[PDB]
Design a protein around this ligand. Structure first.
Ligand code: HEM
Ligand SMILES: COc1ccc(C(=O)O)cc1
Ligand SMILES: [Cl-]
Ligand SMILES: [Mg+2]
Length: 393
C-alpha cells in the first residue's frame, strides 16, 4: 500500500536540484517509505500540515532529526524547546516568545534598519560583490550577535556552530559525521557564552536569564535556552536573505514591483521563505500506531516532513515555482506550523524586511556576474557564493 522509494533526500545530487525528486515524492502517494534511511515521508502540503499540527501523535521529544533519542544518545543535550513536547515545551516556549516579542521588535528595529541601509550603500560603492559573504552573511552578523549581547571574542565560531546543528539533524552521512567530528571548540565557545556573566545586559541572552526570577524557567534552564538562540536564527536567515537576492536577480520584474512599492518588502521576504524554504526538512516520531492519508504507520517510527515540497505543492499553490512578491503566503510551512512554529519568526522577518527595503529604495538592478555556488547542508538549503553587480537607483 505504501510505495517504497530509493531517493536519498540527503544526497548532494538531491541538494543540487531537489525539485523533480520532490514531485516524485508527492506524486507517489500521500505517504511514502524511504528505503535508504528506513523512514516514512510526507511531501504534500496537506499531510505535512496535518503532521505538524498533531503533536501528541507525531512528537518532537524523540528528536527532530533522523536519530531517535529513545535509541541513541543525542549529540548534545536536547534543546528545551525544539526537542520537547507539551507540557515540558510550554514554559521555555513562553519565555522565548516574550524575549522575541512584538514589543521587543520596537527596541531593535531602528538599528537593524540602519545597518541594512548602510550595508547596501557600502556595497553600491564596490559594485561587484558576493551577495552571500558580503550581504546575506555580513548583514545578520552585523546585527544579531549584538542584539543577543555576545562579546566580540569568539564570534568566528557562530556560523560553524549553526552549520553543525543543522547538519546534525541529518542521517549519519559524511556531512553529519564531518561536522560532529572535532566540533568541541565550537560547542565550548557556544556553551560558555550561554552563562549569564558573558551576556550584555539588555540583550536577548540576558533577558532569558532575567526570566528565571519569574518562575517560568529555572536558572539552570537558562543557559540551554540561550543556546537555542545561538543554534537557530543565523544560518536560516542568511540563506533566506541570499535566496531573496537571488530571486530578485532571476525575476527582474519582481525587483521592479518591489522598487515601485517598498512596503512590499515584508511579503517579498515571506515569499522568499516559501520559495527557498531555508529549512527543507524536519522529522517527527510516532507515539502510537496511526493512519495518515490511508497509510498505517506503526509506533516509534520516524516521519520525514518535506517543508520545501509542501511549499511548492501544486495541490495548494498556484505556479509554485514562481517568485511572486504579492502572493498570499499565509499558510506556508517555511516557519513550521502549530505549537513549534518558529518562535524567532519576528526577528527573521525584521531582518529580511529591512534588507529588502534597503534594496528596494537604493538599487535599480541586480545582475549575476560570476559563478554561483551552492552551500550543502543536511537540513538547510542556501547558496555559498552569489557574485552580483549592484546598479544604484
Ligand atoms: C528565515 C529564517 C527562519 C526559518 C526558515 C526558520 C524555520 C524554523 C522552523 C521550520 C521551525 C519549526 C521547527 C519544528 O517544527 O520542529 C523553527 C523553530 C524555531 N526557530 Fe526558526 N527559523 C528561522 C529563523 C529563526 C530565528 C531568527 C530564530 C531566533 C532568533 C529562530 C529560532 C527558532 C527556535 C528557538 C525554534 C524552536 C521553536 C519551538 O520548538 O517551539 N528561527 N524555525
Ligand atoms: C528550527 O531550527 C532549530 C534549531 C535549533 C533549535 C534549538 O537549539 O532550540 C531550534 C530550532
Ligand atoms: Cl553546544
Ligand atoms: Mg560587547
Amino acid at each position: 500500500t505504501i510505495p517504497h522509494l530509493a531517493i536519498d533526500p540527503f544526497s548532494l545530487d538531491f541538494f543540487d536540484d531537489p525539485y523533480p525528486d520532490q514531485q516524485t515524492l508527492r506524486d507517489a502517494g500521500p505517504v511514502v517509505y524511504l528505503d535508504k534511511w528506513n523512514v516514512y515521508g510526507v511531501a504534500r502540503y496537506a499531510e505535512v500540515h496535518a503532521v505538524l499540527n498533531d503533536p501528541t501523535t507525531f512528537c518532537s521529544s524523540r528528536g527532530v532529526g533522523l536519530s531517535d533519542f529513545k535509541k541513541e544518545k543525542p549529540w548534545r543535550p536536547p534543546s528545551l524547546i525544539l526537542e520537547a513536547d507539551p507540557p515540558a515545551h510550554t514554559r521555555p516556549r513562553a519565555v522565548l516568545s516574550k524575549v522575541l516579542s512584538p514589543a521587543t521588535m520596537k527596541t531593535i528595529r531602528d538599528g537593524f534598519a540602519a545597518a541594512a541601509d548602510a550595508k547596501v550603500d557600502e556595497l553600491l560603492q564596490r559594485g561587484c560583490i558576493d551577495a552571500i559573504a558580503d550581504l546575506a552573511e555580513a548583514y545578520p552578523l552585523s546585527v544579531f550577535p549584538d542584539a543577543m549581547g555576545l562579546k566580540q571574542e569568539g564570534r568566528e565560531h557562530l556560523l560553524p556552530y549553526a552549520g553543525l546543528v543543522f547538519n546534525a539533524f541529518g542521517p549519519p552521512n559524511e556531512l553529519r559525521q564531518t561536522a560532529i567530528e572535532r566540533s568541541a571548540p565550537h560547542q565550548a565557545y557556544v556553551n560558555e557564552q550561554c552563562q549569564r556573566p558573558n551576556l550584555a545586559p539588555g540583550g536577548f541572552g540576558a533577558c532569558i536569564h532575567a526570566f528565571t526570577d519569574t518562575g517560568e524557567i529555572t536558572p539552570d534552564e537558562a543557559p540551554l535556552l540561550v543556546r537555542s538562540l545561538l543554534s537557530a536564527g543565523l544560518d536560516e536567515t542568511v540563506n533566506g536573505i541570499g535566496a531573496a537576492v537571488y530571486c530578485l536577480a532571476r525575476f527582474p520584474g519582481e525587483l521592479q514591483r518591489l522598487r515601485s512599492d517598498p512596503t512590499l518588502a515584508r511579503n517579498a521576504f515571506e515569499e522568499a521563505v516559501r520559495f527557498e524554504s531555508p529549512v527543507q526538512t524536519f522529522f517527527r516520531t510516532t507515539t502510537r500506531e496511526v493512519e495518515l492519508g490511508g497509510a498505517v504507520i506503526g509506533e516509534g517510527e520516524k516521519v520525514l516532513m518535506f517543508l520545501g515540497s509542501a511549499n511548492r505543492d501544486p495541490r495548494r499553490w498556484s505556479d509554485p515555482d514562481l517568485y511572486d512578491i504579492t502572493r498570499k503566503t499565509s499558510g506556508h510551512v517555511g516557519f513550521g506550523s502549530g505549537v513549534h512554529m518558529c518562535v524567532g519568526q519576528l526577528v527573521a522577518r525584521l531582518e529580511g524586511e529591512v534588507m529588502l527595503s534597503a534594496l528596494a529604495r537604493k538599487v535599480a538592478a541586480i545582475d549575476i556576474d560570476g559563478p554561483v555556488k551552492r552551500r550543502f547542508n543536511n537540513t538547510l538549503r542556501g547558496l555559498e557564493s552569489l557574485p552580483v553587480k549592484l546598479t544604484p537607483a
